[PDB]
């Protein structure tokens, strides 16, 4: 009844890639780079932790809205479901990767303002 | 050890921006989350939210009554123990953004 | 569209097991979540929880006052609008288990 | 300040693998198989969705407690942080995978009871 759900905050590594299926349905893909931060004891200020890079998918109107509104570097908040997709290596094997099927996404207002236009 | 929460919903009213006596910007708003499954609204959940600093000012400039938002933060609770027991909750907002589910946005850094 | 929450904390009291007039088992318990960072407790957050069916009976059999638990469920809110405004929250528990952070458990299916 | 956090519910695919670092610190690894469920419209009851398999890591006392308490098939609830680890293929390349650094874990009481013993 419950999918595995997630919230990620981070920046897009690149402009959202927008495609259209053969039916005309829009799909946008992008990756969120999430930079955590540790205390870094033994003197010293903060220290950025290893970044997590999550590939995200989103469909139809929401995908179009993402393509119209976000770009490389955009700081975003994303909620969605973690899904495992299967791929194919040039050596025959099927290696999986975890991606986010996005439910909702928006630009963070932490360091930015936004002019919102409702559909 | 902090209990975190993500809520999606609509501002019940325009964010109220103030400044502490110290000069620090603070914004208060309430998120109304009404689940649906175009048939049958669920119970409506109204979460009081507070946020600070530049984010506070960006919220006040960018969002209004009705704006659909994604909010993540820490869930807080108070009890006013009394004459009579009263509790409220509140979310100390870490990040907030307008949802692009049903809208577009022109974004402007800094 | 449902707002979910995960909370980690300790039962304030032994779970209270009842049966609806229908015969359905229900358990009520409250989770006290006290964040720490062995220096400085944070604010304590007490979430009323309800769960149903076999899970209700397993909770009542397995957990007591003090038991450290991991709880995920849907956050619910009520307003008692009145003579005077009063709200409470509650978590409709999807799953619950005792944490193995500071304890072991002998587990027994069914 | 915020890591990317997650809650997963599922079953262990196998008994937890327990190891000890050269310092004597315990580490347990295991994978949670999370089976979501869709409505399956166009007549028909429920239908299990594609399972998500997440590799989980946990350390020290908590790892020992997991090894003492859980086995293959154990239904569990897990909270933790999503981390990307780097590996090495037999063809030279470094392929990453997302894992859970476990904060807390416990056996679900959904279909089971537990005798809890506090340390």
Whole-number Cα distances in Å, A12 to A16, A35, A57, A66: 8, 12, 13, 11
D17 in reach of chain A (CB within 8 A): no
Matching CATH number, D1-119, of 3.30.390.30, 1.20.1260.10, 3.40.50.1110, 2.40.50.140: 2.40.50.140
Segment holding B53, helix H or strand E: helix B53-62
| Three state DSSP letters for A25-69 | CEEEEEEEEECCEECCCCCCCCEECCCEEEEEEEEHHHHHHHHHH
Chain C residues in contact with A5 by the CB 8 A cut-off are 4
Q: What is the resolution of this structure in A?
A: 2.2
Asked if D74 and C3 touch (Cβ cutoff 8 Å), the reply is no
| Among B78, B110, B100, A3, CA closest to D8 | A3
Bridge partners of residue C28, in order along the sequence: C16, C50
Judged by a CB distance cut-off of 8 A, whether residue C12 touches chain D is: no
Two structure tokens written together for A12: 């897009």
Q: A47 CB contacts (<8 Å, ≥6 apart)?
A: A37, A38, A39, A40
Contact C6/B3, CB-based, under 8 Å? yes
Task: Find residues 35-74 of chain B whose CB sits inside 8 Å of chain D.
Answer: 72
Of D35, C87, D81, A56, give the one whose Cα is nearest residue B4. D81
Is A3's Cβ below 8 Å from some Cβ in D?
A: yes
CA nearest to D2, candidates B92, A86, A16: B92
Give, in words, the CATH class of B1-110: mainly beta
- Least CB–CB distance from B110: residue in A66, A104, A112: A112
Q: How far is A72 from chain D (nearest CA, A)?
A: 20
Chain B nearest-CA distance from A95, in A, is 31
Of B77, B70, B71, nearest in space to B3 by CA: B77
For residue B19 the two structure tokens come to: 């400044």
In this complex, do B8 and C3 lie within 8 Å of one another by their Cβ atoms?
yes
Judged by a CB distance cut-off of 8 A, whether residue A1 touches chain B is no
In the block, which residue shows the tokens 């850094």?
B109
User: Quick check: C99 and C72 in contact, CB under 8 A?
Assistant: no
Task: Phi first, then psi: give them for residue C39, nearest 5 degrees.
Answer: -170, 115
What does the domain layout of chain D look like in residue ranges?
A: 1-119
């Amino acid at each position: 009844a419950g999918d595995t759900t997630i919230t990620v905050v981070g920046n897009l590594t690149a402009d959202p890639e927008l495609r259209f299926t053969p039916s005309g349905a829009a799909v946008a893909n992008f990756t969120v780079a999430s930079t955590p931060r540790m205390f870094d004891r033994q003197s010293g200020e903060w220290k950025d932790g290893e970044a997590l890079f999550l590939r995200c998918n989103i469909w139809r109107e929401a995908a179009e809205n993402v393509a119209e509104s976000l770009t490389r570097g955009s700081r975003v908040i994303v909620t969605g479901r973690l899904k495992q997709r299967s791929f194919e290596t040039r050596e025959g094997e099927k290696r999986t990767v975890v991606e986010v099927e996005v439910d909702e996404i928006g630009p963070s207002l932490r360091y930015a303002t936004a002019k919102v236009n409702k559909a």
